[PDB]
Amino acid sequence: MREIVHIQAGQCGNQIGAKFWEVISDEHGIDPTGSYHGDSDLQLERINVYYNEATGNKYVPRAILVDLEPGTMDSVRSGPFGQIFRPDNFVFGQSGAGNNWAKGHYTEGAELVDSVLDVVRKESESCDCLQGFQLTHSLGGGTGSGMGTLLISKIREEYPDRIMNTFSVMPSPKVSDTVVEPYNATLSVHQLVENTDETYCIDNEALYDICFRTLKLTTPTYGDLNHLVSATMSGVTTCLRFPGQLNADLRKLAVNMVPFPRLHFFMPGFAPLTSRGSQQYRALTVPELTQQMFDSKNMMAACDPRHGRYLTVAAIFRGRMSMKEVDEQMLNVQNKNSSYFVEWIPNNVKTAVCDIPPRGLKMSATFIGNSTAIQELFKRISEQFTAMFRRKAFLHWYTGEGMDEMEFTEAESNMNDLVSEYQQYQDATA
Amino acid sequence: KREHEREVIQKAIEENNNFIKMAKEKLAQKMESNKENREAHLAAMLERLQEKDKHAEEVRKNKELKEEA
Ligand SMILES: Nc1nc2c(ncn2[C@@H]2O[C@H](COP(=O)(O)OP(=O)(O)O)[C@@H](O)[C@H]2O)c(=O)[nH]1
């Protein structure tokens, strides 16, 4: 009965957050009304991790919905699984954040954050043994980015001994809403490096390229992007939601994945890559899963793993398959490409198997890699940042909210430090 | 961090207020300078017109002085 409190902040945060709850509610046999109608006890054995029980055996997501405008949250309440959410956990303002980190972190969001922390507290008090928190948000906007990291800092103050986890969507000009996204992202990363234990880096650059090149979607929507996110999120939380030996809770995952405190930005991967309604008929063989899950084309962060080294890896296979063949294939990857795994962390690849597959598939595999190649992501954001900041472009939006140019300089420097720290261990030898 | 967060928002308040202030002062100063300038322009105009009246009195005075002689 180790509970996780979920928070979703902003448009992006609530969009994927909603899809996340749709997917796993279906995996746990919970319907839009909160009633269980599954055919396996494995579905309810660890249901308490993400759900609260009410009278009539109703299952209520331990989820808090946050935004500075009511737009997306009204869409969620009118969505398929809208009713399932605890109505009082809908915490929203009216002013919006205007894609402005400063508005979310210092002014507009500061006004709303206490209200959110009240709901968090009411949830946490009900917990038998709170593991920690998972946050879904984008880093390119204002609310999810600015207020999201504000929440994280406050939550760490009240719950300093609990694990902080995030699903952070990284901005990309291929799907850009605004030109100030590199600013918001750089300021957010600065917060994440300090105040999170585990961050899944979900790059919109990657999600777009996957949708276009692989899934052959000529005009990718956010729905096409979130089909990939929800599928990844379900996968990385499998070990948390079902019985298992490996990475069964947030802390044990952190201990396995995070050799150094600042280097906790994970590169997720998923196989097989599918589009919505594709409904493919041939299951993949265990060898096929293993080759694809490690393939660059299946990474949700636009980084080439062959350009860096793996510090740690977590692989999760779902569905009825040969655990013997899985072990063999996993051992085969490491032994065939041993150069890409740091030799000074022995046996840094851990594998889990879950009998229950995701809907629409007989076989699937989820990848979680702590690679030094993730620096490519932060480099990219840093280049976009400096291109504008060298001319102090668009800063007036931020100085108008009380921010000083120094705070940008500090944020940039810390991210450039993160990049250099990754490069340090990419060259390190035993 | 909490102290810095307070320092940022109260700086935003301070700058918004200082803008409102200086705008209010700039305007009141402009409307006062304009008032004094326009009144001075009108005052000078009448001052010249009133010297025409004085001159006209001297003309009629000068005629009366030339008459009996
Ligand atoms: N994958 C995905 N990304 C999104 C979505 N909505 C916005 N974004 C990304 O998030 C950034 C905009 O942030 P947004 O969530 O709209 O700002 P906020 O709601 O004020 O926190 C951009 O970089 C977008 O690419 C979404 O539904 N899906």
Ligand SMILES: [Mg+2]
């Ligand atoms: Mg938006």
